[PDB]
Design a binder for this molecule. Structure first.
Ligand SMILES: [Cl-]
Ligand SMILES: [Cl-]
Ligand code: NA
Ligand code: NA
Ligand code: NA
Ligand code: NA
Ligand code: NA
Length: 515
């Protein structure tokens, strides 16, 4: 039986004083969760771990999220810490950024659970999602067994939650805003205040108008604007014709309709449960979704296109008949461009935007680190920038680099926008940059930020962003950014070109959710 290795010293910890197997975990049943915060499957099992953490609240048991990074941005401890906050992780987390623990145990995928005994022997090793009951069973067995031997110690752990270390988390008006939308005719900005579980509506200068989902708790409720609840929502799309806001309500696996004419919120598809349905076609909320991350609206045929980050697909909600179908993507996580939906594949797509023609849709394909164009007529896709165009299986061709074709390198882009002039704006998220893509030339240029996570409101080329993920634009040319880990809405007036500077949009009247 494998004896788990000790954690190396000068491995940083979050949510806790540094732990080790010989001093603090001796006498505990431990689940090692090998994860990385860019993995939607890693995200998919956090609620499994929350289940076990609550079930075994006052038993000698602990989850340790061994964060083994995929992307290079993910080795920075402050990146993981923002993820730990965004994801509501409260168990111990250690940044094993060079995968020492990963390799020593033989971990192959994300996520992968290693269950360790009070003595330090590895008694089970499970990979993949959908193993809540399997883990529930091992931990039960281990507990009632090693408790029979009387080798368990229920001394507390040196718990120091990161969310209890920051005064401003409660204070800031916005908590990790991710996605944006705009109503230029009536001059309104739509903010996905993700980790406040609400939707904030202001004016293009920054002035509060109305708040949808007022209690700020995580929940899943339809009804009035004060009674509604979301769960860390992400993408938004605005229906000018009917004065509606569509919400990709990611952690409820649902599509919500914010109805401003009637001041109510109603659910269009999904039901709070992560589906595993790859064809779809059912009506309204009979149809399950899976981590809808971005949503955009096509007003001619009245179609809502959903970037289904959970299943690597683009889906299509139809306003006329309330049906949600797969639109493109066969289900495998690949950077596979093909003529037909079934011969096409995405990699955790998280951003979707319609071109001015209304005939293509550009996709932030975060896990292949590429921008792609989905053909609305054929359900097929083409590669614009990034990715490994010779290997669809390759999901590790990332970096930071401007240019054309193979010269381009990105890193987990989350956000994409198509201006009415038909140029493409993206947030290279792990590079903390805004970048511009031209669809014809396929040339990508850095437009803002230095590549270094932080905050600074300077002249764009030396200014700073922290993991930006959302975009919206005016015809005047002001480009709003959702600067996520800075919990700020920036903006760039694009007219000024090489003279231009990124600013912060000060919000007037926007207060955090009552506690
Ligand atoms: Cl989340
Ligand atoms: Cl069926
Ligand atoms: Na959106
Ligand atoms: Na429902
Ligand atoms: Na599959
Ligand atoms: Na298919
Ligand atoms: Na089609």
């Amino acid at each position: 039986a494998t004896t788990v290795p000790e954690f190396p010293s000068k491995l940083d910890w979050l949510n806790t004083a540094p732990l080790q197997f010989r001093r603090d975990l001796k006498g505990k049943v431990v689940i090692l969760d090998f994860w990385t915060y860019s993995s939607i499957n890693s995200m998919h099992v956090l609620p499994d771990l929350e289940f076990l953490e609550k079930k075994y609240k006052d038993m000698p048991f602990t989850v340790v999220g061994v964060h083994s990074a995929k992307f290079d941005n993910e080795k920075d401890l402050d990146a993981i810490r923002n993820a730990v906050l965004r994801y509501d992780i409260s168990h111990p987390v250690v940044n094993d950024g060079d995968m020492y623990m990963w390799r020593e145990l033989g971990i192959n995928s994300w996520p992968t659970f290693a269950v360790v005994s009070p003595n330090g022997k590895v008694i089970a090793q499970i990979a993949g999602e959908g193993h809540r009951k399997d883990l529930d069973d091992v931990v039960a067995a281990a507990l009632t067994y090693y408790g029979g031997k009387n080798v368990l110690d229920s001394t507390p752990l040196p718990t120091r939650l990161e969310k209890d270390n920051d005064p401003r988390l409660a204070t800031s008006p916005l908590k990790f805003p991710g996605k944006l939308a705009i109503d230029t005719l009536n001059n309104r900005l739509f903010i996905s205040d993700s980790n406040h579980n609400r939707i904030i509506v202001t004016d293009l200068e920054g002035n509060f108008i109305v708040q949808i989902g007022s209690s700020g708790e995580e929940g899943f409720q339809d009804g009035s604007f004060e009674d509604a609840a979301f769960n860390r929502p992400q993408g938004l799309a605005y229906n000018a014709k009917k004065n509606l806001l569509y919400v990709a309500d990611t952690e409820n696996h649902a599509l919500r309709e914010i109805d401003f004419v009637n001041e109510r919120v109603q659910t269009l598809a999904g039901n709070g449960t992560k589906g595993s349905d790859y064809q779809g076609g059912r009506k309204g909320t009979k149809q399950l979704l899976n981590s809808p991350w971005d949503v955009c609206f096509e007003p001619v045929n009245e179609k809502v296109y959903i970037a289904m980050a959970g299943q690597h697909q683009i889906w299509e909600y139809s306003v006329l008949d309330g049906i949600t179908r797969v639109f493109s993507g066969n289900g495998y996580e690949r950077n596979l461009n093909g003529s037909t939906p079934q011969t096409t594949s995405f990699a955790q797509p998280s951003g979707i935007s319609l071109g001015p023609d209304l005939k293509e849709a550009y996709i932030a394909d975060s896990e292949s680190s590429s921008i792609r164009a989905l053909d609305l007529q054929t359900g097929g896709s083409r590669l614009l920038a990034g990715g490994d165009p010779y290997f669809s299986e390759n999901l590790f061709k990332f970096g930071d680099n401007d240019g054309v074709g193979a010269e381009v390198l990105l890193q987990h882009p989350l956000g994409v926008l198509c201006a009415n002039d038909g140029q493409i704006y993206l947030t290279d998220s792990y590079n903390h940059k805004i970048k511009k893509l031209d669809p014809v030339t396929k040339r990508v240029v850095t437009l803002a930020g230095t590549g270094k996570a932080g905050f600074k409101d300077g002249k764009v080329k030396g200014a700073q962003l922290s993991e930006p993920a959302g975009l919206a634009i005016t015809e005047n040319g002001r480009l709003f950014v959702a600067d996520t880990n800075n919990s700020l809405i920036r903006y760039i007036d694009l007219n000024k070109g090489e003279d231009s500077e990124i600013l912060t949009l000060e919000l007037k009247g926007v207060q955090p959710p009552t506690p």
